[PDB]
Design a protein around this ligand. Sequence first.
Ligand SMILES: [Zn+2]
Length: 36
Amino acid sequence: GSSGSSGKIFTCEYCNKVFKFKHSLQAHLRIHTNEK
Ligand SMILES: [Zn+2]
């Protein structure tokens, strides 16, 4: 049996790291950007 699953990915515009789901990237952006 397979060790995991892959498909369409989501890429960080700041460090070029890739993720499997949109919310995984959007939460990673909080190290690169801020909000007030
Ligand atoms: Zn990043």
